[PDB]
Amino acid sequence: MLPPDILQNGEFETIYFQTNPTYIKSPIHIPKSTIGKPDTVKIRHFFALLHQDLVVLGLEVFVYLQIYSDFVEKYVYVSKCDTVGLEKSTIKIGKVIGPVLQYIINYNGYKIKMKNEYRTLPKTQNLRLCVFTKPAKEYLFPNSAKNPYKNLLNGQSLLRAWISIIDSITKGWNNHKLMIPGADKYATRKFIEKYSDWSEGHIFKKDGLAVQAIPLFPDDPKGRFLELVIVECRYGKMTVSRFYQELAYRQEFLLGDCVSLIGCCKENLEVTYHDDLVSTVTISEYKEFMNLLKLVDFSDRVEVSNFVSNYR
């Protein structure tokens, strides 16, 4: 998951665990009218890098498997990424995030129970990677913003950094899409002018109703608008095109700083299912870890060191 030159035989340590794979309702609305509906299995992944007793950075990723008879639509959603910045930065963060995220994308050792012993997934997978960039001061680590070595990027800088990461781990993929809702074509194109495989737009179905095309991911700027469309029972009228048009005027985008949406796809990848023993936990155990995290003052080495010792 990480190369020796980073971990350095125990100078750095990792926290990494998954939830037990859990069936959920599809994050994309599938009419009960549809033929051969998929089962949806969700896995949460949490990764942190440690340096001695301190957290250096964290990454939370959700994987959604839409399981059809003959193939899987596999969505990989980057939920959160953050840094602590209590110590002067030793590694380039992208050199950690890329490989970890690539490991999560390609991970195929999930132990999925049968739908009411373990289910065998189809060998054909269509990958979809979905990331948004929005320059918050603190995604995972409360009060880290006024740490001395936390490097806070503005929106354009954050976007450039994520395009670089994602490009590096999606070599050969079928498409790479960037949308900056509310920006003109020229401004968006400048971010990807040096990336031959990238183009403006999104990865989802282009026509029809938005809720039947766009996944509703938790704590996603896109998802929050989708949520509104659904709660106001406008799901039956809102098109994909009009959704992306109106997204641009939401407060989060229009008042935001280069808030951007990235999606990449790889079609018809033949995968082999490959046991890889990692720590797996109940959703309650996961949520309990995350709730503890929320209560740590990450400007306080004592509290961070305590949090880490407790996890051990």
Task: Give a topology summary.
Elements: H1 4-7, E1 12-19, E2 22-24, E3 39-51, E4 54-67, E5 71-83, H2 94-106, E6 124-133, H3 155-168, E7 175-179, H4 185-191, E8 198-200, H5 221-231, H6 240-247, H7 251-254, E9 260-270, E10 279-281, H8 283-293, H9 301-311
Parallel strand pairs: 1-10, 5-6, 7-8
Antiparallel strand pairs: 1-3, 2-3, 3-4, 4-5, 6-9, 7-9
Describe this structure in words.
Helices cover 27% and strands 27% of the residues. By secondary structure, it is α/β, with parallel strands linked by helices. The protein has one domain (4-174, 264-311). α2 crosses α3 (155-168). The chain is globular and about 55 Å long.
Helix-strand string: HEEEEEHEHEHEHHHEEHH
Coarse shape: globular
Largest sheet: 10 strands, mixed
SS content category: alpha/beta
So how many helices? Answer: 9
PDB class: transferase
Keywords: acetylation, nucleosome assembly, transferase
Assembly: monomeric
Entry title: Crystal structure ofF RTT109 FROM Candida albicans
